[PDB]
């Protein structure tokens, strides 16, 4: 459907936990941490209280992009908003609709594709926490935004995708016609360029033109550096049909070293033409 | 000097991949006529293009395009078994579509814009050797009513080279003050770049020109780009600046000192370029 | 506070001086050269005459972005538009309003967040001059732009902010409510990603959406590379209140090695909670 107007106050538990291999992740339920962390979804105007527990043995933080938070929810050591080993703390994120200011100018709303990550593990910029996997997607919708059938997050962290061993995807499945949403976050040291075979989107808030008067470049390829976040919705297979549609960083060595995955768009019968496993 | 019409024609073209001097490989429209960059494809939103392809090399090659509609059988990857074995032939079909209102009430963007095609199998199964070797080219898909330029020039930053040329060898392009000049800019390889033109500027959007007083697109003369990025614009040569040898270059400092520079030689109506002196 | 319609003829002297430590800077009076250079503001339509003088022992130039200049003001040795040691030149920049061409298309105005820099020190592309400090900002306003209470310029020159040593800011101060203009320039070899805590803006010309029909992405983070320039206006603390709000390049080793600084937003009473 469509996103309603917001303004609810939401509460959720979140945990930072150690995972295998010196990795670390956020999770909504203890023992269910993951990398990327859980996807947060808000309608503009919602407030979200994150009751947060650090189950690790090193201080950790929650720092969000793009949303409204006071300095006590910055999630940084420099204003003592980190969480000590064993400690707990409520982080609050607010968001707002757009509107006219009394000064006659237009105040942008919070709507968009954002992300949260650690800011204190290893360095005062979270270089270790981010590298171990403390990051996840936040989506803030505007009233009237079209809603997807599925959302998939794709995170270029250094030379990996979602901290996975090279050459292991992830793959994402869908049926021709599905309204599929991608969240694309970049973290760490390197720039990249994100490409999707067979698909394309508009380079604006939503990845869809708002109608025939929207001048945004339509693209299938985008450069991004650390902490960028963007998102788009595609119709699976539109104009192209089913198949295993590669997506990859297009920096050539990066695709050859395993920053590749498969958008597996299936016919209505669940098969993928020409896909040999 | 007119306007792109509505599309819908079924077009067909022969294209070859052939070796060139120095281990370079290029696309062509006629045998022994390959160029780096390869030849420019122009479609109008709605055209279907059939590329009757021929590999004239000893090694496999493929043809993968950005942005245009193609089924999985015209992917041009080994993974999808759509490459060309040596001495072989294959018809690649690219389709395009106009914008329109979907059933769900949303708006489908049309295929129009500045795109490109490259190899996907030489060297690695991502075309890393093929792209290095020069197997890349521009595709312009126009929307009904897009202004057409007096000339189109293509500028490809392939790694540390421009159009696989030697350093400090341009290329240079000429125009006359007031010409509507179209630039296609494509990037390939490992490195990010920043493309700058002295004397000129454009809007960062689909066409490179604002649509009217309401278009918020930023106006820029410098643009960060990366591998497989492609954008395009039309400028008016000499606009508010006049004739002269207008340099263009990548703006990463080391890249411009190594020779990623060229000239936009804009001439007065009589043919003179003030102060030019190679 | 709105910008007026342009069209004045303005004049300015500019000097290129050595500074401490093999650095070089532009300045509006002798012995007043700064890194980054002095902020030049113009309205769409203005012409600006820069009487430039090179007080250095090596040739220097002055090249601009985005503005209208003839080839004689290009500011490169290629056109012999460089200034030899001790010498003087007048560089002339012009600007235009938007409006429709005879051929029917829309011509964009000059308004934007631009900059100027050397083109001949060290190499024929100013690599040594830029590395040395020879860059500064230029803002050009469109009639009706809203004006700001303060403009701050932030230049990522390779691994430094404004050629400063690592971990030495700079910091900027405001008061909750203040309407602040940031100018962001990048020079050198590297790409960066600029990021501000607690604040966000629109990725368009002005930094703010024109109204509900602007589709520009709203962001708090932007990739950029050498000779990119952009700007934006924020309402300090808007929706977030006071505090020492960090900015930095978000490339992890850059923030770790000192490409960081603070945006100090004060309560009306002067104080910064938590600082
Ligand atoms: Cu930070
Ligand atoms: Cu990459
Ligand atoms: Cu592709
Ligand atoms: Cu961040
Ligand atoms: Cu590919
Ligand atoms: Cu370059
Ligand atoms: Cu320039
Ligand atoms: Cu490609
Ligand atoms: Cu230059
Ligand atoms: Cu940086
Ligand atoms: Cu932040
Ligand atoms: Cu420059």
PDB file of C-alpha atoms in Angstrom, chain C residues 3 12 23 40 44 60 72 78 97 105 128-129 134 138 145 157 160 171-172 192 200 212 214 227 235 246-247:
ATOM      1  CA  UNK C   3      20.003  38.592  -1.829  1.00  0.00           C
ATOM      2  CA  UNK C  12      39.279  43.912  -5.257  1.00  0.00           C
ATOM      3  CA  UNK C  23      52.826  27.294   2.516  1.00  0.00           C
ATOM      4  CA  UNK C  40      34.287  36.541  -2.327  1.00  0.00           C
ATOM      5  CA  UNK C  44      24.064  37.033 -10.273  1.00  0.00           C
ATOM      6  CA  UNK C  60      51.441  31.968  -9.667  1.00  0.00           C
ATOM      7  CA  UNK C  72      42.782  35.844 -21.011  1.00  0.00           C
ATOM      8  CA  UNK C  78      49.156  27.675 -21.347  1.00  0.00           C
ATOM      9  CA  UNK C  97      21.243  35.564 -14.426  1.00  0.00           C
ATOM     10  CA  UNK C 105      16.423  26.318 -23.909  1.00  0.00           C
ATOM     11  CA  UNK C 128      52.161  22.461  -5.700  1.00  0.00           C
ATOM     12  CA  UNK C 129      50.210  25.703  -5.358  1.00  0.00           C
ATOM     13  CA  UNK C 134      46.404  28.568  -2.786  1.00  0.00           C
ATOM     14  CA  UNK C 138      33.427  32.093  -4.104  1.00  0.00           C
ATOM     15  CA  UNK C 145      18.326  33.630  -2.021  1.00  0.00           C
ATOM     16  CA  UNK C 157      43.000  19.382   0.994  1.00  0.00           C
ATOM     17  CA  UNK C 160      43.917  17.934   6.089  1.00  0.00           C
ATOM     18  CA  UNK C 171      35.882  24.645  15.106  1.00  0.00           C
ATOM     19  CA  UNK C 172      32.993  26.977  14.334  1.00  0.00           C
ATOM     20  CA  UNK C 192      36.357  12.056   0.942  1.00  0.00           C
ATOM     21  CA  UNK C 200      21.177  17.539   7.350  1.00  0.00           C
ATOM     22  CA  UNK C 212       7.177  20.379  -1.636  1.00  0.00           C
ATOM     23  CA  UNK C 214      11.769  19.510  -4.967  1.00  0.00           C
ATOM     24  CA  UNK C 227      37.908  20.463  -7.150  1.00  0.00           C
ATOM     25  CA  UNK C 235      19.358  26.096  11.130  1.00  0.00           C
ATOM     26  CA  UNK C 246      31.096  16.893  15.205  1.00  0.00           C
ATOM     27  CA  UNK C 247      31.873  17.146  11.520  1.00  0.00           C
TER      28      UNK C 247
END
